[PDB]
Amino acid sequence: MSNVSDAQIQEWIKRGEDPKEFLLKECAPQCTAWKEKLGRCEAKLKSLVNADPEMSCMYPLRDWVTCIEACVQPAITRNLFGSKYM
Amino acid sequence: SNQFINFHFMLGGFRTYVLERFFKQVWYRRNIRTFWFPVLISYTSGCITMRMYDNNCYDYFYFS
Amino acid sequence: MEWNKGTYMSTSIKKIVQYFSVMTVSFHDINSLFGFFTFLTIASQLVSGTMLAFSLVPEPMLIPMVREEEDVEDLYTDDFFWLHERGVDMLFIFSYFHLFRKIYLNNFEYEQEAAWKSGVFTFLLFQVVVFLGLVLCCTHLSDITLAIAANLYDTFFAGKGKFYWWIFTSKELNTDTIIRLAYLHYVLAFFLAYLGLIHGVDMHYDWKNESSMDGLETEMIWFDEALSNELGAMIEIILIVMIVCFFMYPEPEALSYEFFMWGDIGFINDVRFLSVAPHWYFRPFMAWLTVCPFHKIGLFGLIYYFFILFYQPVIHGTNEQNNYTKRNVAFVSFFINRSDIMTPKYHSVEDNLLHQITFWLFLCSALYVTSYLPYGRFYNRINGNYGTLWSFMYIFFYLGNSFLRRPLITELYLFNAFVKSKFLKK
Amino acid sequence: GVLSEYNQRLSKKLHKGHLVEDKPTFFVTSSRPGNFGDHIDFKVNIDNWFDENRVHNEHETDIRRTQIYTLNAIYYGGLLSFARLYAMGVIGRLNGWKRYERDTYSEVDIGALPPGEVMQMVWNGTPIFIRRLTSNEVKEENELPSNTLLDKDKEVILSDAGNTKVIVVSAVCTHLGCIPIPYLGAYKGYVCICHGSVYDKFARVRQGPALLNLPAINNSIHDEGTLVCMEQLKFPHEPSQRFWA
Amino acid sequence: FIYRDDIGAFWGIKGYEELVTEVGTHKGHNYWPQFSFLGTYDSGSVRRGFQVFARNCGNCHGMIYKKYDYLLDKAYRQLELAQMVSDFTIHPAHQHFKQYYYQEWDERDRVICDHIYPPYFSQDQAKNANGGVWPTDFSKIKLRPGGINYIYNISTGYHFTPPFGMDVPKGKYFNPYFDHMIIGMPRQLVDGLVDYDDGTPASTPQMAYDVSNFINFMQRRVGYKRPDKMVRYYMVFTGGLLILPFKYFKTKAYYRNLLSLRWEMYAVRDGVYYNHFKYGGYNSRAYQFRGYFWA
Amino acid sequence: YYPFLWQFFILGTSFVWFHVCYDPWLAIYQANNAHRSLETALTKEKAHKKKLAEQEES
Ligand SMILES: CCCCCCCCCCCCCCCCCC(=O)OC[C@H](COP(=O)([O-])OCC(O)COP(=O)([O-])OC[C@@H](COC(=O)CCCCCCCCCCCCCCCCC)OC(=O)CCCCCCCCCCCCCCCCC)OC(=O)CCCCCCCCCCCCCCCCC
Ligand SMILES: CCCCCCCCCCCCCCCCCC(=O)OC[C@H](COP(=O)([O-])OCC(O)COP(=O)([O-])OC[C@@H](COC(=O)CCCCCCCCCCCCCCCCC)OC(=O)CCCCCCCCCCCCCCCCC)OC(=O)CCCCCCCCCCCCCCCCC
Ligand SMILES: CCCCCCCCCCCCCCCCCC(=O)OC[C@H](COP(=O)([O-])OCC(O)COP(=O)([O-])OC[C@@H](COC(=O)CCCCCCCCCCCCCCCCC)OC(=O)CCCCCCCCCCCCCCCCC)OC(=O)CCCCCCCCCCCCCCCCC
Ligand SMILES: CCCCCCCCCCCCCCCCCC(=O)OC[C@H](COP(=O)([O-])OCC[N+](C)(C)C)OC(=O)CCCCCCCCCCCCCCCCC
Ligand SMILES: CCCCCCCCCCCCCCCCCC(=O)OC[C@H](COP(=O)([O-])OCC[N+](C)(C)C)OC(=O)CCCCCCCCCCCCCCCCC
Ligand SMILES: COC1=C(OC)C(=O)C(C/C=C(\C)CC/C=C(\C)CC/C=C(/C)CC/C=C(\C)CC/C=C(/C)CC/C=C(\C)CC/C=C(\C)CCC=C(C)C)=C(C)C1=O
């Protein structure tokens, strides 16, 4: 009888909508240490008057986005058709 | 043809045949007892030097 | 040629068949079977490479497309390519384990000379073939390897008069260079089989699984009693390698070393020089080049490593004078009040502890050298890894210097104990 | 069983895991040469495995010999299975693999062709003859001498549609591949002019140097001659499965 | 020996430090049916991936090394694939090597045997049409940070904004998954862009997932053959485990049996002198010692 | 006592090895991926096509 009855709820994906936009905000809080580090790095770079061209607020941002996406991507992929549902 | 197919196998228990013979007397007495010190020193030194190299790399990449 | 006295064995089919049907092998362990594994991997490399040669068109602009298309339309071609790559990996692993095992047993004696050098030469040739094989991939890795080899070749001639053209035409991979290098690769790969046969015949003169002289006189008949064990040990090591590769390498991976093989010569012009890395077996030499930014010194280091690896029996051997050779010593002369020192005699393997300590320091230094890429982008601007320099220098010292091998301390201490005991007991 | 044997072997008195003699043992062969004398005090043997390593089956030793042979056979069979996989790989590499058969289906309308006419069509990049035979023509072809015919194995395939049988054959000469004459007054069949090979109206080999009839073209007629399905004959090619699952 | 995990180099592989490469493999685990234990490609997923590739992203990219007929058993049937691919045209200028086989002198409908060329004749034409940056060829694209995930991440990672100190030139877009986080590709996946034949909802994550599955399927080592080869590895490993005991019986027990020898030494005191020991012995390498050693 | 018969026996043992190591893994592998076959996708597409065809306009 399973899978032969109606589905009670429809997700964003089941309606053809993109859920990553909201899921980014959902997963933002837990990656807060890296966000704070990135903010401090940006503040310091803004303060500097003669900054070496090598310096960049890129690697801290790389770590922050890595931590955000590590949570964002698997959650969305698990809801997609074609993959064994979690 | 008149001898055991697998002679002197598991005589005693696992402890005597495996834990005490194949590990303490064959692996440690013969192999580990010879290289535990040099291998440990080299492994620790390599770990420390690689950590220092990575910390210098971090200082290069990351400021603030 | 009166200087050449003759050959140890006449490699004729009749005599080879008789010798291998009457051969006897003493009881041994797995550690003394890396040579058989190397030979079997060589045989499989020959077979798989012959299968691959019928697919590879030596034109650079067709090799990638030909490889991609012939893996689908033809069955087992990609299987043979994978077998060839993994055979190269396992061949390097077995060869280096064999080298370490033979260094451990102190096989630099005179009676081992013919056994030792004939092996090293094979190893040396085994290097060249591998290099040529890389060139056949026609990727950016092949481009960089060819460029480095051409620069090294041109180093000897001080960059004069394009002496490299007969092989490395323009120092670039093109139709002529690819054709020549592929044919040379095939021919030298098949020559390696004969070199290995000669080495295997030579080494049986004095073969020992362990340094200690077991008194056993009975021995196994090679054809099946020893061959079955050799095949089984090969199976066991292959199982272990499969387990280690399965767990250490997840199915999808991030930042592998194969990512530099994306670029195909001709199709992609720009090269991502940020991530340049060869296969792990040639990793130590690229690491040495990065660590030693001086071109001539790096080339000299490579040549010295290989050639001192070849001439171990001469520097560290008895030298036919029965340990009456006199070394040259820097500081011990002041302590002993003698200009030279007689070579020490008691340098056993299993018993003494200094030999084991030094050998395992050397082995761990080699492993650390192959452990990673120095990443020359700022490896020198940032004070480089001191461990890499220490390991390289210890590799150089261990191979060539006889104070780390056959040390005098053991002999002097043993003689001191002998003198004291004899005086006490008269 | 296995548990019983393990229990039996558990209670074994041995020195640090090795079954060795606890006392010196000396054995002298009573029938040794007269010049050997007594055994020397040297203790050559530390183990008595010559006697301990014994299953006392001096009766029916051939059974244990057969068992050892069987174990050897199992080991060799595993090794030979691996070698057979390798040999399959090699030979399959040498002998190509036709993963799938490319499409060759086609359709040509023959109804428009007037009866007793031969038309050339381009199928699979090759010329092909399409002909219509009347009842009188077929009857005339039959009853002719069989001496001229030079193909006992070859036959003729005639369609049944459109009120007149339709024939489709390969328009390639068997001798060397030249295009034969389409129509001749003596016999409205095929007669090659490059060397004089003579065929009949059924494409048979009558009084001609060519030793083979014109190859037939696989076809099936439907829609009463409007839809002549033409697909190249399919031959087996194995292995056919490309994916296990 | 120990590699720091915050440098930006995974397991010590330096380089790729201006990219986000650990997402989906090391930090986070995106599920792909192909790489799961005893897994395999989802036929529907690769089918939809080819549908989206053909209806979009085939207008800039291509797989010169690959051809459509790879999709003949797990993604499409011969007739269906032929009908789908007959919607595109190839000029002879597309061909990498005509070799006298391609006799056409004008555009013609593609067949399943044709290689997957982009609409442009050459790389320079595509580079000129796309603002001077060449849409990379997807054949052999497996060799990217993250592997199969690389296609999925880039197609989706257009949400973040550049930090301070980074300038995105006009015509360029910020995407942290690309080299140096600047990419010349405008975002292509939009909800409802492609109407799947099976009715599956067309959301950008779903389209990215299908595209990634198809692109991976078209590879050679990590592509359509990896699952069967992994099953073959499992079977061979089982065979080795089963054969180990028989190897032991053949080799080690047999050697132990051969060493069950009884030795005896007696005292021979007859008049005979041991002259054979004093005058005897042969050395196979004597020719190397004669005239050279101990003279 | 008949060497070629014993060789046939060895061939049989190798055949048993191959089948033992082959059949179970293949069976479990193709049982695990039953729902990922092309037939499932074809059935889903056919159902969707039928549903779309029945409900439409002129
Ligand atoms: C890092 C990782 C972690 C660490 C890793 C560590 C790794 C460690 C590796 C260690 C390797 C070395 C191991 C050494 C073991 C030594 C054992 C020992 O002491 O033996 C001595 C012993 C005799 O020594 P002895 O000292 O002379 O004896 C003294 C006695 O007092 C007097 O002796 P005797 O004269 O009485 O005996 C003479 C002997 C002489 O007899 C022979 O030589 C005849 C041998 C005939 C072999 C026939 C093989 C048939 C294979 C196919 C079977 C069908 C498969 C169906 C599969 C699908 C099922 C649904 O006959 C016997 O003893 C008869 C016993 C056998 C009965 C018949 C069954 C034989 C086959 C059993 C195995 C196959 C099971 C299949 C699965 C079943 C369901 C679970 O030797 C034997 O008898 C050996 C018999 C053969 C054993 C083979 C075992 C293979 C197992 C494979 C299957 C595994 C489980 C299932 C897996 C399923 C999924 C794939
Ligand atoms: C256009 C067409 C052209 C023609 C094409 C056809 C060409 C035909 C070539 C025929 C060659 C005849 C060779 C005669 C000797 C063969 C062995 C023998 O005596 O047999 C009795 C033997 C009787 O059974 P047994 O009582 O159990 O004894 C087994 C032992 O082998 C019994 O051995 P053992 O323990 O008593 O002692 C073995 C050995 C003691 O051990 C050794 O010393 C071994 C050899 C050491 C040196 C070589 C090392 C490498 C080992 C040999 C190479 C093996 C790999 C070959 C790979 C080839 C390429 C793939 O002692 C000897 O026998 C000394 C002589 C060894 C043979 C060499 C001298 C005679 C033959 C060659 C003379 C001419 C010179 C050669 C160049 C000629 C050029 C024209 O017969 C068998 O067991 C045959 C079993 C066959 C079935 C199992 C394997 C099937 C393959 C499975 C893989 C998948 C493919 C399936 C097959 C597909 C269809 C083919
Ligand atoms: C369709 C095929 C039809 C053909 C026949 C198929 C069956 C053939 C079975 C052949 C025997 C296989 C097992 C023994 C192999 C060695 C053979 C041998 O040398 O025998 C000759 C000989 C015995 O002379 P024999 O009396 O003439 O031969 C009798 C036969 O061998 C027969 O002996 P047995 O009948 O007494 O065998 C009993 C055994 C076999 O009986 C069976 O065949 C039944 C197996 C059923 C398996 C089912 C699995 C699940 C799948 C089915 C699920 C659905 C059904 C559920 C039903 C539920 C019902 C409530 O049943 C057991 O499972 C009990 C064994 C004790 C428990 C051990 C637990 C595992 C410990 C592993 C430790 C490993 C440590 C390594 C690392 C150490 C260092 C750290 O052996 C010796 O003398 C060796 C003694 C020295 C070594 C002792 C080592 C003991 C510890 C290790 C044991 C390793 C094996 C464990 C097997 C576990 C089950 C797979
Ligand atoms: C040391 C050797 C390996 C370690 C373990 C020890 C193995 C030896 C012990 C005895 C084992 C006996 C039983 C083995 C049965 C295996 C069956 C199997 O998987 O093949 C079925 C299949 C049968 O295929 P099939 O006919 O069902 O279908 C083929 C078509 N496809 C691919 C679409 C399914 O075998 C093959 O066809 C494979 C041929 C390969 C030829 C070229 C060699 C490639 C490498 C193969 C081995 C890879 C593993 C690692 C090898 C390392 C050493 C080189
Ligand atoms: C040089 C000494 C031997 C070297 C051994 C290594 C392999 C050498 C292979 C090349 C030489 C082959 C010579 C014989 C030619 C016939 C080959 C053949 O099987 O026919 C294929 C042919 C062609 O296969 P096919 O028709 O499926 O493929 C061709 C057509 N396509 C590509 C469309 C699929 O198949 C047959 O018709 C054979 C049917 C009979 C099968 C039994 C043959 C027995 C005699 C040959 C046995 C060879 C065993 C070799 C074992 C080696 C072990 C290491
Ligand atoms: C410095 O420059 C140089 C180089 O490059 C740098 C060089 O490479 C070299 C060396 C290299 C070369 C000269 C090139 C050589 C290249 C080589 C060896 C590569 C090929 C290697 C191989 C192992 C090829 C193996 C090939 C095969 C197995 C193909 C098998 C094919 C066939 C047909 C086998 C069956 C047929 C036969 C045996 C013929 C017998 C007769 C028949 C069958 C008759 C049939 C007909 C009838 C009517 C019956 C030199 C010297 C050099 O100076």
Ligand code: HEC
């Ligand atoms: C034309 C408008 C394009 C469409 C349609 C698609 N892509 Fe593309 N892509 C395009 C350009 C001009 C570039 C180069 C960007 C640069 O800065 O170099 C790219 C690049 C990619 C990449 C990266 C390739 C690399 O070597 O790193 C990927 C992974 C990629 N594009 C994927 C992709 C996907 C999934 C598309 C939809 C299926 C797609 N592209 C469409 C231009 C165009």
Ligand code: HEM
């Ligand atoms: C001991 C013997 C051999 C060794 C050590 C060896 C080494 C190598 C190596 C290292 C590669 C590159 C692999 C890679 O980059 O991943 C290679 C490729 C290649 N080898 Fe060999 N090889 C040997 C024998 C042979 C033989 C005998 C032939 C031909 C008869 C051959 C033909 C080839 C071909 C064609 C390639 C390239 C295949 C491709 O690019 O698709 N090899 N070899």
Ligand code: HEM
């Ligand atoms: C492809 C390269 C090589 C092959 C194919 C090969 C092959 C073999 C084989 C089969 C054996 C017998 C088995 C064994 O002793 O383990 C052996 C032994 C030996 N090898 Fe090699 N070998 C190679 C490389 C080397 C190297 C690099 C050295 C030394 C630098 C070397 C020196 C020796 C020596 C001295 C022995 C005899 C050991 C002894 O007498 O105890 N070989 N070789």
Ligand code: FES
């Ligand atoms: S060409 Fe037709 S008969 Fe000679």
